Amino acid sequence: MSNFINIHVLISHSPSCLNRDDMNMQKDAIFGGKRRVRISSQSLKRAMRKSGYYAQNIGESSLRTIHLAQLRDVLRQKLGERFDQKIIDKTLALLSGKSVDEAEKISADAVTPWVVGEIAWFCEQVAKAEADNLDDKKLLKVLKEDIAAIRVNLQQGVDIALSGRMATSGMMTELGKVDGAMSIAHAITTHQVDSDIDWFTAVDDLQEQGSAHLGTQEFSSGVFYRYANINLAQLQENLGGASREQALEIATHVVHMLATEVPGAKQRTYAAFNPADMVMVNFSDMPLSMANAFEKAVKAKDGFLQPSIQAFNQYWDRVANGYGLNGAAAQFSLSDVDPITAQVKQMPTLEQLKSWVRNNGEA
Amino acid sequence: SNFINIHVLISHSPSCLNRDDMNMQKDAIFGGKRRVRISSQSLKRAMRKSGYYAQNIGESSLRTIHLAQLRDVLRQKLGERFDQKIIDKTLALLSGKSVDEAEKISADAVTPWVVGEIAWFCEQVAKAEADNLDDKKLLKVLKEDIAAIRVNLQQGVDIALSGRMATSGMMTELGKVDGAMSIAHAITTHQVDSDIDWFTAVDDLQEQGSAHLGTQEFSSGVFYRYANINLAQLQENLGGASREQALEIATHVVHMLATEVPGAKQRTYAAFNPADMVMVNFSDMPLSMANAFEKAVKAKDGFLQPSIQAFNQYWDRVANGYGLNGAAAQFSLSDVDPITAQVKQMPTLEQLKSWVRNNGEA
Amino acid sequence: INEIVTVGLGYKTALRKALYTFAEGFKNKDFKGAGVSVHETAERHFYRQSELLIPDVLANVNFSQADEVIADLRDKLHQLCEMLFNQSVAPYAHHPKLISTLALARATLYKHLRELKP
Amino acid sequence: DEIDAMALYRAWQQLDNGSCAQIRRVSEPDELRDIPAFYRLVQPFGWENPRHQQALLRMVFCLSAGKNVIRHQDKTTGISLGRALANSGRINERRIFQLIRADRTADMVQLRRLLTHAEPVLDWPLMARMLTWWGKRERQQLLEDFVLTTNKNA
Amino acid sequence: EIDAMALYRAWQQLDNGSCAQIRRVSEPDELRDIPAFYRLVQPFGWENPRHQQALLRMVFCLSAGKNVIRHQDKKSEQTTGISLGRALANSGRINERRIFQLIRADRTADMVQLRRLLTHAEPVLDWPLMARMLTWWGKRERQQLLEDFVLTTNKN
Amino acid sequence: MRSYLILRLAGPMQAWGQPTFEGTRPTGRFPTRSGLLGLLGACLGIQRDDTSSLQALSESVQFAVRCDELILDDRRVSVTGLRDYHTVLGAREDYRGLKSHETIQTWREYLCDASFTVALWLTPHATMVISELEKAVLKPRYTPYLGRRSCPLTHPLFLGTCQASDPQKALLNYEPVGGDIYSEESVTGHHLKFTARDEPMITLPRQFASREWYVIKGG
């Protein structure tokens, strides 16, 4: 069992509002007939992309936009010393399907993730049109043959290699379709939650102290369960046939981010900067989520955290024994517990867990 | 008995494993109550296109049908309709090795769709010998068809278990291959409270900012999958065929039902959950246990436990009343158990598959 | 005949309008909409149940003296619209955000249904 | 077929300041079970039949807001709790979102705090029946009534 | 798996010495220290801990005296036996505020109070009922006790 | 005094054909003759190629269908329709080649919650006995469904056997009474017809011919 790597995270948050509705209400979801506070998987993804850790260890994130009129200026700024403006314009025009007018505002069909590396690569490839003129469709047919060569430039993307992208217009609809490679679930609380409401006011220094109607902000604490899953082969493919070890390094970065990164919503005013209390990683031939460990909403004994850990471990034992799974399984917990069973190796620190992942579960 | 019944109770975390033409969860009214549904085609594709299927069925030892083995039988089943020379011509064009050259391994029975197709070929080479277009001239016009049957003669178990592949070079009425496993629509055991995810799309160049709005329906729930296997049909379409082999395939079907999940929005919702219960029982007639949840299950401590309970309690009073007989085995992850014995309790799934493989004998 | 047809179509449009309002919402006093298309799958139910009632009576009425048949028809269609409305709205009626909307949607529904009586 | 009469309300009106003081001083309906004056009050209706106990706990708990918090007004049908709380104008709809999302004892608490703050006028038997069941449809209907009335009086 | 009425009978038949040893005890936990208790309670529940607490309570109540708790079988017309609340009410010596304080007590304290009441009441009751309420001794049982007392006084 | 075989059709979803050459594949409120004949045919193990056994079975037997309305918690649950959006990837472009479309779409109506009690009897020109049919529906050879393979049974086909003069009188012996009945035999005091194109033209696959039900209405 060594194609899919499964990441399970139990993380408790102090009173906050990490993800909102269209009525500025806490995102929720019904599980096991009970209301759970929810964090969007898109929210977690973006929280990862725009994180400092990602910038330090993985690289630059993709630039998602529809505004090609601004994007042409950006690309002209970052690629102007390497290419001519007409070539860049023809490049972006070919990829998007729209025309670069030097106008004030021209938009694309939808929000698109652009990585400057592959765009520079496309500038180099469209510079072959400066050579013996191939028709644009001809050049397209040439590029169709070697997609791996395009995916090599996606190592400056990765978030695209992890989350994928879809194009509707331009040349990107035939060259830029990325499928894999990371499947992440919506973070839901392991227990039933009755959300509290902050009834706030706004003191007017030129009128107050006086009467005023009040405002509302829905907030809540809770033990969230995050799940992620990485298809190593698909990641290797998405990076242009990259080595497995590299994919595992990226995987460890994903582990760390999933264990530490928290969406920055309402953090200036609520500040729920809490680390994960449990992180388990297991290799498998088939993806496996332990959400059904909380299908029966956990009830508080000494908080929601400990019975969540306990329920998680119990359900993992039941599933593991029932379906005869054999990892490659390691668990990291802050709390002292009675977890089990061999060989779900206990890691004292998170870094030892990440190291255990880098060495393909054998360490 | 001829039929194998597979019943699966599996819980799914918040997701959307099946959509309609308007990006909404597929549903079905049962007992007057709305149930979230996962179409049978979605499940059957999720199985047929899976890697486990490709390993245990895509590469089975009985996937290749050698025509040279079927020399004699095809001569006596089509001797009423065609002459021997025509048949030998067809086999020589299809194999394509003429010699007879008895393999010392001449089969006893033949798969129906095979004789159905090669009969069509016999007709074609007959009218081709009447026209008459020479062997090369006609082999030129029958290229796609010949290749089409040649690829089918290497996928015996796939066709036998799942049916033809929706684009197989089949023409005759016998070429319409059904079964051998029947997959039912997976419905929730309970009434579902559907949630609506309200998402946006952030523009990195105007974060001020006008938000791109969107909605997507999702819901968690306990689904009841049902499937059955016709062993006689599976043996006939592999004919062949020993019952033990058919059982060996049936085990694969059980496993796939207990594990495989559709890939709809699994990249964003990730409902990679395993089956919390699976029971297998032999019978002279296939029967779904859907009426166990005809009255919508209401949550006591989740939906899973009262679903297990409802299922078992239904099986207790209903099982003997209907023609279920024996034998039956159940693999679950939580008590209680059905008060009735004659339903062996299996600790692991592998023990259950081993139980199926031994024709339900202890 | 024209009256029977227009009655049926009238109740149809009542239901569809109500559910559409439940979908899109009411912008003026900031009532949020569900974001789902339930009107189309409910209209099919309405139509399926209507094929049993309207042609059946329309075949067997004494046109000279049969407005009371049209009246019981109105009653049956009314009940049908109520039932189908509540059924279509049921899975989404657990979030206050949407309950506040379905209050008004139901209100408009009964406005139209009230306007269908002679 | 056994219904709790409106007499209870009248009884609550006519009860002495001492016992009413003992009753008002309560956080939860179980603590209402704790005090004797409650049993003396609720016996005729009555308490000794467990089918009625929960309903009585809710009703008495709501009345415990005060002697003249819940103002009875005769009616086609009388003013409902939603319509009442809406007409009061002092209640914010978010707190009713809270009320509909609350669980067990909590909701009753939240309800009581509302009544004291609202001083509502309503037909008491309606509220009595709704408290008798207090299912999902009672909650939903409450929110509907409130929202619709507030929208209709703005 | 249930404790019989035999215990009561046993308590009736036991000699004065051991009864003296048991009677002079302040708390139910202090009852564990003396051996005569173990000898008395040995047939019924030890070593199955599920009954132990209950037994500690029961004997403690019985420790009030040899003929303090007077047992009366339920009449065929009565359908249910006289309850502890009804008993304390019928006695007429008990003031309701001490039963209020009884419902407000916690753990050992309540038993301390309860015994003190029995000695002052000399109540008549159906012993299996009191035993049953003492086995669990949840909040509902307490409140039910108060129900019986207050309701008995108000109705009669 | 005819002999009747009484069967039950009780899936959570059901489908009974109606005239169609398009993607949208509709259903009726009750089983069709072609459907029931295909059902018994499946039970008996009749392949699609042999016109003989098909013809024999079709000429041999006749049907009567009773619509059983569902009652649970003394509440009536009327029948309802479904519209399944059913796509195919890699479908046939042509009948002969291996060329395919990326995606085709079909719409398929289903029937929940429907249950039926069906009484069948032998024609005078019968080629088999009711015993063979009983033994067949008790121990089928091919998987029985109603009427798509997606739709399984929740109650055994065989419900019983009886002696009676009318199919109505034969149906009365079994529990869910009061449902409408569509038979191929007429009963006194009953007039209404119901037209349907559900009699399979066996000589010519795969098309159907017009026929009519006799309608009986109870209470």
Side-chain angles (χ1 to χ4, degrees), chain A residues 1-80 82-85 87-88 90-97 99-103 106-127 129 131 133-144 146-207 210-212 214-244 246-339 341-342 344-363, chain B residues 1-84 86-98 101-103 106-130 132 134 136-139 141-142 144-207 209-299 301-336 338 340-341 343-362, chain C residues 1-67 69-118, chain D residues 1-74 76-154, chain E residues 2-8 10-12 14-26 28 30-41 43-46 49 51-65 67-73 76 81-85 87-154 156, chain F residues 1-74 76-124 126-134 136-174 176-219:
Chain A
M1 300 195 178
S2 49
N3 184 24
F4 290 94
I5 164 180
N6 298 304
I7 318 170
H8 316 263
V9 171
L10 262 58
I11 171 179
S12 178
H13 287 296
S14 56
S16 57
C17 193
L18 302 175
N19 213 239
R20 260 179 288 164
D21 213 350
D22 50 320
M23 198 183 269
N24 288 288
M25 292 188 114
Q26 279 183 314
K27 286 216 179 183
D28 57 340
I30 293 188
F31 195 20
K34 299 285 179 52
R35 178 188 188 265
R36 325 292 187 90
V37 171
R38 181 173 54 92
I39 304 179
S40 303
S41 61
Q42 303 87 22
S43 184
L44 298 179
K45 279 179 169 174
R46 181 186 172 85
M48 285 180 172
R49 303 193 309 260
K50 300 292 176 294
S51 66
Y53 180 85
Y54 182 89
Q56 286 182 351
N57 292 266
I58 302 189
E60 191 170 7
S61 67
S62 182
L63 189 143
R64 307 168 188 265
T65 185
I66 78 176
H67 297 340
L68 306 174
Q70 304 292 328
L71 185 59
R72 62 165 174 88
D73 299 332
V74 177
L75 290 178
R76 278 172 186 177
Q77 281 187 340
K78 297 184 65 63
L79 297 183
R82 295 173 56 184
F83 302 93
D84 190 24
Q85 292 185 346
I87 308 302
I88 301 178
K90 194 162 86 75
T91 307
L92 179 60
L94 281 173
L95 293 182
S96 60
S99 183
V100 178
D101 294 271
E102 194 80 13
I106 53 109
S107 301
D109 294 21
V111 286
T112 308
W114 303 97
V115 287
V116 298
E118 87 177 348
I119 295 180
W121 186 85
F122 277 126
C123 289
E124 295 187 7
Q125 298 305 314
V126 81
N133 289 276
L134 281 168
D135 197 19
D136 294 333
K137 215 75 168 75
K138 284 255 175 195
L139 173 63
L140 206 168
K141 185 173 183 175
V142 173
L143 297 180
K144 261 218 204 300
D146 199 336
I147 301 181
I150 312 182
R151 293 301 180 267
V152 171
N153 291 268
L154 213 61
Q155 300 193 17
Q156 341 293 338
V158 183
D159 66 331
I160 294 180
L162 284 174
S163 301
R165 67 179 169 189
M166 173 190 177
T168 307
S169 63
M171 191 176 299
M172 291 286 289
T173 186
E174 298 182 1
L175 295 180
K177 180 59 187 300
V178 185
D179 288 320
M182 180 188 60
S183 308
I184 188 177
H186 290 215
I188 58 182
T189 59
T190 62
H191 54 90
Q192 179 183 14
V193 178
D194 284 347
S195 301
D196 304 326
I197 294 185
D198 179 34
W199 298 81
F200 58 87
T201 61
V203 182
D204 196 309
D205 292 333
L206 289 156
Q207 183 195 19
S211 181
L214 298 89
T216 66
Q217 178 55 232
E218 193 181 36
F219 70 96
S220 69
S221 59
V223 180
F224 293 82
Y225 163 74
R226 306 179 176 186
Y227 171 74
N229 159 80
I230 297 183
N231 190 345
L232 295 173
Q234 184 64 29
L235 184 56
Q236 298 179 62
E237 175 183 1
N238 285 10
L239 293 179
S243 61
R244 179 182 173 92
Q246 180 177 347
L248 266 65
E249 297 171 4
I250 299 185
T252 57
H253 291 341
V254 174
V255 173
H256 183 270
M257 284 185 299
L258 194 68
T260 58
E261 287 301 312
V262 180
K266 283 295 185 179
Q267 296 291 73
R268 293 304 110 85
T269 51
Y270 285 80
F273 304 102
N274 312 96
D277 285 89
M278 192 203 61
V279 183
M280 190 191 75
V281 171
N282 78 94
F283 295 80
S284 61
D285 293 319
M286 192 173 187
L288 175 130
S289 176
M290 304 264 78
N292 282 332
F294 321 112
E295 196 280 320
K296 178 204 302 179
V298 304
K299 284 170 169 50
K301 288 184 282 84
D302 277 326
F304 288 113
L305 185 55
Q306 295 301 109
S308 302
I309 311 287
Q310 204 166 358
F312 179 88
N313 293 318
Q314 291 178 358
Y315 188 71
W316 166 254
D317 282 335
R318 277 188 255 269
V319 172
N321 288 277
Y323 287 95
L325 320 176
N326 40 24
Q331 184 183 23
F332 157 71
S333 178
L334 292 183
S335 175
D336 40 41
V337 264
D338 64 293
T341 84
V344 55
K345 299 181 180 180
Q346 293 294 328
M347 316 301 295
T349 68
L350 179 67
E351 278 182 332
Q352 287 197 29
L353 176 60
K354 291 187 293 182
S355 294
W356 176 85
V357 177
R358 281 187 223 266
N359 213 327
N360 202 336
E362 287 128 13
Chain B
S1 298
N2 184 27
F3 290 104
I4 289 184
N5 295 270
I6 311 172
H7 315 265
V8 169
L9 265 61
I10 174 178
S11 176
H12 286 300
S13 54
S15 58
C16 187
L17 299 175
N18 205 324
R19 274 176 289 166
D20 67 335
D21 57 317
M22 291 186 300
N23 280 330
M24 290 207 306
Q25 271 180 314
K26 288 197 172 184
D27 48 19
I29 295 182
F30 192 25
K33 305 271 188 170
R34 175 184 176 268
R35 321 291 182 87
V36 173
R37 179 175 50 95
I38 299 178
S39 64
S40 85
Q41 55 259 15
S42 185
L43 285 175
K44 186 168 183 176
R45 177 182 180 87
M47 294 171 55
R48 197 197 178 123
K49 292 295 185 177
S50 64
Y52 182 87
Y53 191 96
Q55 285 183 356
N56 298 268
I57 296 161
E59 300 296 330
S60 174
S61 298
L62 299 175
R63 69 179 177 90
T64 53
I65 294 92
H66 305 85
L67 296 181
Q69 308 262 301
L70 309 170
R71 179 183 62 90
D72 291 316
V73 198
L74 291 179
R75 285 182 181 179
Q76 69 111 336
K77 292 189 65 64
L78 299 193
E80 298 289 335
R81 186 174 171 183
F82 300 102
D83 299 336
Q84 185 170 330
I86 283 82
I87 300 177
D88 296 19
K89 274 192 66 63
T90 52
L91 301 189
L93 296 180
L94 294 177
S95 316
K97 347 168 193 173
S98 163
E101 175 63 70
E103 300 279 287
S106 189
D108 182 32
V110 189
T111 306
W113 72 261
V114 174
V115 318
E117 294 294 294
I118 70 128
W120 183 91
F121 276 86
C122 285
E123 180 177 351
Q124 295 302 324
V125 310
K127 74 172 59 180
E129 191 184 352
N132 58 323
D134 195 72
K136 306 296 182 178
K137 298 289 192 301
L138 67 92
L139 199 145
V141 316
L142 293 185
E144 294 197 38
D145 306 331
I146 288 179
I149 187 181
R150 279 217 198 102
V151 300
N152 284 325
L153 291 179
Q154 297 176 350
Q155 297 175 340
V157 274
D158 178 37
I159 302 176
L161 179 64
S162 302
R164 64 185 191 179
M165 211 176 177
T167 316
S168 300
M170 311 249 190
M171 303 127 181
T172 184
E173 193 69 21
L174 283 165
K176 302 181 178 184
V177 188
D178 328 335
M181 62 173 183
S182 304
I183 315 298
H185 293 267
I187 61 182
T188 54
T189 64
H190 58 89
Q191 188 174 12
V192 176
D193 290 16
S194 293
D195 301 312
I196 301 175
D197 182 33
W198 202 88
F199 59 86
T200 64
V202 186
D203 195 311
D204 291 332
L205 287 174
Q206 51 122 358
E207 219 182 273
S210 66
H212 181 280
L213 319 179
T215 60
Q216 179 59 57
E217 184 190 21
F218 71 97
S219 69
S220 60
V222 179
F223 288 78
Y224 166 70
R225 305 177 178 183
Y226 170 78
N228 59 76
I229 304 173
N230 188 5
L231 297 180
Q233 176 179 338
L234 187 62
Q235 293 178 250
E236 186 179 7
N237 288 7
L238 290 176
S242 69
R243 181 181 180 90
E244 290 73 18
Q245 291 164 327
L247 297 178
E248 189 271 341
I249 297 179
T251 65
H252 296 328
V253 178
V254 174
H255 182 268
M256 282 185 295
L257 248 86
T259 56
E260 297 298 333
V261 177
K265 291 221 161 302
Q266 292 286 71
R267 298 255 178 82
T268 53
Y269 283 95
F272 301 126
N273 314 100
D276 286 86
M277 194 271 291
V278 38
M279 175 186 294
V280 186
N281 70 93
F282 296 78
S283 66
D284 293 322
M285 190 201 307
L287 286 176
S288 176
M289 301 285 98
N291 280 154
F293 324 101
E294 189 175 27
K295 186 180 181 181
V297 174
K298 296 189 177 179
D301 283 325
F303 283 113
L304 187 58
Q305 260 191 342
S307 303
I308 309 289
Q309 187 180 17
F311 181 86
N312 299 337
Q313 286 182 353
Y314 179 85
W315 176 273
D316 287 336
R317 63 175 183 92
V318 168
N320 186 30
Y322 298 175
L324 268 334
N325 279 65
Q330 185 188 27
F331 159 73
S332 61
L333 302 183
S334 58
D335 286 28
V336 305
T340 40
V343 178
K344 300 185 63 63
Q345 225 68 24
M346 318 301 293
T348 67
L349 181 68
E350 297 299 318
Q351 289 188 31
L352 177 59
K353 293 197 303 176
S354 181
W355 175 88
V356 177
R357 189 162 51 250
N358 291 329
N359 198 79
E361 194 205 43
Chain C
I1 289 179
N2 201 44
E3 181 174 25
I4 303 194
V5 172
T6 52
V7 160
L9 291 168
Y11 279 85
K12 174 192 72 67
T13 56
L15 180 61
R16 173 176 196 280
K17 282 185 180 179
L19 289 189
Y20 190 80
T21 57
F22 175 74
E24 75 170 333
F26 309 84
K27 239 76 173 188
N28 263 68
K29 273 143 195 173
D30 218 1
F31 284 83
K32 306 290 165 171
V36 290
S37 304
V38 295
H39 57 281
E40 200 181 318
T41 180
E43 195 180 68
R44 285 188 250 102
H45 281 92
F46 178 87
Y47 270 160
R48 254 185 238 109
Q49 184 54 241
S50 78
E51 290 177 348
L52 300 175
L53 294 181
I54 290 179
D56 193 280
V57 298
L58 193 142
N60 308 330
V61 293
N62 182 28
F63 296 82
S64 58
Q65 189 76 38
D67 42 29
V69 188
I70 304 186
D72 69 66
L73 180 66
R74 293 187 222 262
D75 288 22
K76 292 186 182 300
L77 292 179
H78 180 93
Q79 289 180 32
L80 180 59
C81 288
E82 283 183 2
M83 181 261 185
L84 286 182
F85 177 85
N86 291 322
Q87 172 175 298
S88 305
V89 165
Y92 310 108
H94 58 80
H95 195 324
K97 191 195 45 186
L98 307 186
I99 308 194
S100 306
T101 304
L102 66 81
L104 301 182
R106 180 178 270 113
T108 63
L109 172 69
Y110 281 118
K111 183 188 60 180
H112 288 69
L113 288 185
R114 183 172 296 102
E115 290 180 2
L116 259 320
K117 301 298 289 185
Chain D
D1 178 34
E2 293 289 335
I3 297 294
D4 299 331
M6 177 170 59
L8 174 59
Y9 177 76
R10 301 197 195 96
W12 171 254
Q13 293 295 267
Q14 298 180 7
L15 189 57
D16 65 323
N17 305 324
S19 300
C20 285
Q22 300 185 7
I23 296 177
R24 292 192 302 267
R25 194 193 188 277
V26 76
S27 49
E28 295 184 354
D30 306 335
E31 289 194 8
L32 198 62
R33 288 180 183 262
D34 276 319
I35 64 173
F38 166 74
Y39 295 123
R40 264 185 276 105
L41 180 64
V42 77
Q43 182 194 28
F45 302 107
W47 183 256
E48 302 175 351
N49 190 10
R51 291 192 293 102
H52 294 85
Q53 286 187 351
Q54 270 299 304
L56 292 165
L57 284 175
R58 297 174 174 121
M59 290 171 67
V60 177
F61 187 84
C62 287
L63 291 174
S64 79
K67 295 188 180 185
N68 207 29
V69 167
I70 297 176
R71 305 179 180 182
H72 180 23
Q73 184 158 105
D74 295 89
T76 64
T77 183
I79 312 183
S80 174
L81 180 56
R83 301 193 179 95
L85 297 179
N87 288 327
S88 76
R90 303 177 182 177
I91 307 302
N92 184 293
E93 84 171 13
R94 280 275 186 160
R95 206 170 289 266
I96 299 176
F97 287 7
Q98 261 189 314
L99 181 55
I100 306 310
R101 285 197 164 288
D103 298 327
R104 290 290 317 280
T105 57
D107 59 35
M108 288 311 296
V109 175
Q110 300 206 322
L111 181 53
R112 184 160 73 91
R113 290 203 220 96
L114 282 183
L115 299 158
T116 65
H117 194 251
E119 310 262 302
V121 297
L122 55 87
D123 190 30
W124 174 243
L126 265 64
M127 192 172 154
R129 302 197 195 105
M130 169 186 70
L131 284 175
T132 304
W133 308 116
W134 195 239
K136 193 173 66 63
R137 64 180 184 95
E138 279 73 50
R139 299 189 205 244
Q140 180 175 340
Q141 188 64 68
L142 176 62
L143 193 145
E144 290 190 26
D145 290 14
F146 182 85
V147 172
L148 196 61
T149 26
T150 345
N151 181 264
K152 283 303 178 179
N153 299 331
Chain E
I2 297 175
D3 299 331
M5 176 171 59
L7 175 59
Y8 177 87
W11 172 254
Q12 293 295 267
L14 189 57
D15 65 323
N16 304 324
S18 300
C19 175
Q21 299 297 146
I22 296 177
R23 175 173 168 176
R24 191 172 301 187
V25 75
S26 49
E30 190 184 10
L31 198 62
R32 301 176 177 267
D33 293 333
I34 63 173
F37 165 74
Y38 294 122
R39 188 207 316 159
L40 180 64
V41 77
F44 299 110
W46 292 72
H51 292 85
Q52 280 193 8
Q53 269 299 304
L55 293 165
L56 285 175
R57 298 174 174 122
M58 290 172 67
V59 177
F60 189 84
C61 287
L62 291 175
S63 79
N67 207 266
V68 168
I69 297 176
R70 303 176 61 177
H71 181 23
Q72 184 157 105
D73 293 83
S76 58
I82 312 183
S83 174
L84 180 56
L88 297 179
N90 288 135
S91 76
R93 296 185 177 93
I94 306 302
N95 181 233
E96 84 171 13
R97 318 190 206 198
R98 287 196 164 281
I99 299 176
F100 191 17
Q101 299 297 335
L102 181 55
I103 307 310
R104 284 289 192 270
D106 186 25
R107 206 177 157 83
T108 57
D110 59 35
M111 287 311 156
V112 175
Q113 300 205 322
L114 181 53
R115 183 161 73 91
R116 205 173 265 123
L117 282 183
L118 299 158
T119 65
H120 194 251
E122 310 262 302
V124 297
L125 55 87
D126 190 30
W127 175 243
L129 265 64
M130 192 173 153
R132 204 173 311 164
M133 101 178 312
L134 283 174
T135 304
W136 312 116
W137 196 240
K139 207 172 186 178
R140 182 58 57 87
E141 280 73 50
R142 300 189 206 244
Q143 294 169 341
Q144 188 65 69
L145 176 63
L146 193 144
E147 290 190 26
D148 290 14
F149 183 88
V150 173
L151 274 189
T152 296
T153 57
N154 181 30
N156 277 321
Chain F
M1 203 71 163
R2 289 184 184 91
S3 311
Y4 293 89
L5 179 60
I6 303 91
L7 307 182
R8 177 157 296 178
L9 312 182
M13 312 171 54
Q14 316 200 2
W16 304 112
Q18 289 196 332
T20 295
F21 295 80
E22 310 81 49
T24 305
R25 301 207 158 273
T27 56
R29 294 293 171 196
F30 57 95
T32 49
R33 188 177 195 264
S34 51
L36 302 166
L37 286 176
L39 192 281
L40 298 178
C43 294
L44 277 165
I46 305 174
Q47 305 184 69
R48 279 167 213 176
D49 66 331
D50 61 327
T51 312
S52 311
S53 299
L54 291 173
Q55 189 68 275
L57 176 64
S58 178
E59 68 174 7
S60 183
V61 303
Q62 283 200 334
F63 299 99
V65 183
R66 184 184 66 189
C67 310
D68 300 338
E69 193 172 4
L70 175 64
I71 304 181
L72 60 90
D73 293 317
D74 55 67
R76 293 198 185 269
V77 189
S78 54
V79 192
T80 307
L82 258 196
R83 185 184 182 86
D84 186 49
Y85 185 73
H86 188 166
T87 66
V88 188
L89 302 165
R92 296 188 301 275
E93 175 176 5
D94 299 320
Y95 295 103
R96 207 183 190 188
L98 293 169
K99 298 178 177 179
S100 52
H101 304 283
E102 283 198 9
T103 312
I104 65 148
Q105 57 190 309
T106 72
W107 304 261
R108 314 207 189 183
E109 302 176 357
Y110 286 88
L111 216 62
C112 47
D113 305 327
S115 173
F116 303 101
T117 307
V118 179
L120 68 146
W121 62 95
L122 302 166
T123 201
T127 53
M128 64 189 73
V129 71
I130 201 77
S131 183
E132 183 177 358
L133 297 174
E134 201 193 321
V137 301
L138 284 160
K139 300 176 64 178
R141 302 178 62 178
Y142 286 157
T143 61
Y145 44 85
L146 24 65
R148 303 190 178 114
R149 202 168 286 265
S150 314
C151 307
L153 314 170
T154 330
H155 182 286
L157 276 171
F158 179 79
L159 182 54
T161 56
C162 79
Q163 297 288 110
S165 58
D166 287 12
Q168 185 180 7
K169 277 171 54 54
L171 286 172
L172 259 52
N173 299 90
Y174 294 91
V177 198
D180 286 338
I181 300 170
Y182 297 80
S183 61
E184 287 176 325
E185 181 175 341
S186 59
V187 188
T188 62
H190 296 297
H191 210 74
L192 279 72
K193 307 269 198 294
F194 186 68
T195 66
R197 186 174 291 279
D198 54 13
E199 187 156 12
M201 281 170 65
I202 299 174
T203 66
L204 173 66
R206 185 184 176 279
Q207 292 179 329
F208 305 89
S210 176
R211 188 181 57 80
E212 284 167 8
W213 299 96
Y214 290 137
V215 178
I216 313 177
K217 297 182 184 178

